[PDB]
Design a binder for this molecule. Structure first.
Ligand SMILES: Cc1cc2nc3c(=O)[nH]c(=O)nc-3n(C[C@H](O)[C@H](O)[C@H](O)COP(=O)(O)OP(=O)(O)OC[C@H]3O[C@@H](n4cnc5c(N)ncnc54)[C@H](O)[C@@H]3O)c2cc1C
Length: 456
DNA sequence: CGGCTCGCGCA
DNA sequence: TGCGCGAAGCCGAT
């Protein structure tokens, strides 16, 4: 609907109806940014055609109680900066608290909304909120994929078994969907405190804070400055200083050669399409560029495909049949070690390498990409059952990772424990044919002692 | 039938 | 360190 630089395949209608006379309402959930936001740009285009203002609404749910302070402050501080950024474009921002199914329905009626637009997320709870809103409103409802370069329903129509079958499909659609972002035109017609929401939330999460023996907090918040502006700086420094050596040193946890974009990419503080555009134009190592593009395009967006077409993405049923049969047969195998959630959480295992991986997660909130596999696969080896291992890994991932509660997390954990998007390997006790990682294998690929000594 | 995002022996 | 082989089931081009 209207616009020359807007691909209609990025927008899909969730509910048809007569368009109202009021402003266009953008229900911002996943892409918390002002620039490079297709959902915000599309909302502005519909508003321009209808000669109505565009507004953004945010619903603060009770889900932050399941998380900790580290995600709350990171997310809330970025929204404060986003509030100023949208204010400069004469776009008002309304921050609501409560159930989005009931709050969004009330906001549309009270504000006399004409059209409702929201971003795309394949998570279960997002689909539940959308259906609740659909039953309570009478205006057109649209959904825009502002997170993936190629829209999730357009890249593939089915669950993808592996990357090698999804890679040609994604790369074929890149020329159509990889394009520059038009600038966000400000509003022409003009028409809760975030500080109070922040101060209340930390008070409710203070008891659940991760502490040391001397009651000192474990989380170090100076490693990643949140916000749209800081996310851009991280991207620029990656291309200039780190992209060249990414291809060779991405699997070395002792070297800070990763992009460190996942906390911003999870909260939508930066667009992966913007990152792809800058990386494509960069003159760097061709092997490094191909390796990084495979990470942010194929593996990031296949995680959306996994969650979109598998409602049980965080369960044992989502595993492939070969993986399920292999794990089932080894249920009665005697485990070399039985560890509980608390012992995993405190880093109280016999493995100093695994403990150091947990400490990096506890202290920085972002464990290195390579050690994340060894972290999750040892949980399977040292748990009562595959279901318990899946529960433990998801719990610690979602509680302590800044990029937690993300499709990349569920696909990554399902890859590690259930062989999702993987293949079978040598038969072993307990883990069966799931891919095996050993402490000695990590020794021959990076300096394990340096990584251990860094995080005690 | 070819080829998939580990460990391991060997220079 | 970097390279080639081994051990496993299966998708997808035909
Ligand atoms: C068990 C396990 C759990 C995971 N949990 C999370 C999580 O909670 N949140 C999360 O965002 N990612 C998760 N991943 C994926 C991966 O660990 C992170 O994306 C990455 O380590 C974050 O660091 P980075 O952005 O600097 O990595 P980079 O090497 O710089 O990667 C760049 C971007 O590519 C994407 N990406 C890279 N590797 C993967 C991957 N394996 N799967 C999917 N996308 C990928 C991410 O968007 C990332 O920001 C997990 C991986 C594993 C093995």
């Amino acid at each position: 609907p209207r616009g020359s630089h807007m691909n209609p395949k990025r927008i899909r209608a969730l509910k048809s109806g007569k368009q109202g006379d009021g402003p266009v309402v953008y229900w911002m959930s996943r892409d918390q940014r002002a620039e490079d936001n297709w959902a915000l740009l599309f909302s502005r285009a519909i508003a321009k055609e209808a000669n109505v203002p565009v507004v953004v609404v945010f619903c603060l749910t009770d889900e932050f109680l399941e998380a900790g302070i580290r995600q709350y402050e990171f997310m809330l501080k970025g929204l404060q900066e986003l509030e100023v950024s949208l204010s400069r474009k004469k776009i008002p921002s309304f921050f609501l608290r409560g159930d989005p199914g009931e709050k969004i329905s009330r906001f549309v009626k009270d504000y006399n909304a004409g059209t409702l637009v929201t971003d795309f997320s394949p998570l279960r709870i997002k689909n539940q909120w959308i259906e609740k809103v659909i039953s309570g409103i009478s205006i057109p409802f649209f959904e825009v994929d502002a997170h993936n370069v190629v829209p999730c329903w357009e890249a593939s129509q089915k669950h993808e078994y592996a990357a090698h079958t999804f890679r040609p499909k994604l790369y074929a659609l890149l020329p159509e969907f990889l394009e520059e972002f038009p600038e966000l035109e400000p509003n022409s017609v003009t028409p809760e405190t975030l500080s109070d929401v922040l101060e209340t939330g930390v008070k409710a999460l203070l008891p659940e804070r991760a502490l040391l023996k001397n009651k000192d907090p474990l989380f170090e918040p100076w490693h990643f400055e949140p916000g749209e502006k800081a996310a851009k700086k991280v991207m620029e420094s990656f291309i200039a200083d780190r992209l060249d050596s990414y291809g060779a040193l991405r699997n070395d946890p002792t070297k800070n050669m990763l992009s460190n974009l996942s906390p911003y990419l999870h909260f939508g503080q930066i667009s992966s399409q913007r990152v792809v555009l800058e990386v494509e134009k960069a003159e760097s190592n061709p092997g490094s560029k191909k390796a990084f593009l495979d990470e942010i395009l194929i593996w990031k967006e296949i995680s959306d495909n996994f969650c979109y077409y598998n409602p049980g993405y965080d369960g044992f049923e989502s595993f492939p049949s070969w993986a399920k049969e292999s794990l089932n047969a080894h249920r009665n195998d005697v485990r070399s070690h039985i560890y509980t959630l608390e012992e995993f959480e405190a880093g109280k295992t016999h493995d100093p390498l695994w403990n150091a991986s947990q400490m990096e997660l506890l202290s920085t909130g972002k464990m290195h990409g390579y050690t994340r596999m060894y972290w999750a696969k040892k949980i399977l080896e040292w748990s009562e059952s595959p279901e318990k291992a899946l529960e433990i890994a998801i719990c610690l991932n979602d509680r302590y990772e800044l990029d937690g509660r993300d499709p990349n997390g569920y696909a990554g954990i399902a890859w590690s424990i259930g062989g999702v998007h993987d293949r079978a390997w040598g038969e072993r006790e307990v883990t069966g044919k799931i891919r095996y990682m050993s402490y000695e294998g990590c020794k021959r690929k990076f300096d394990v002692k340096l990584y251990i000594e860094k995080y005690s």
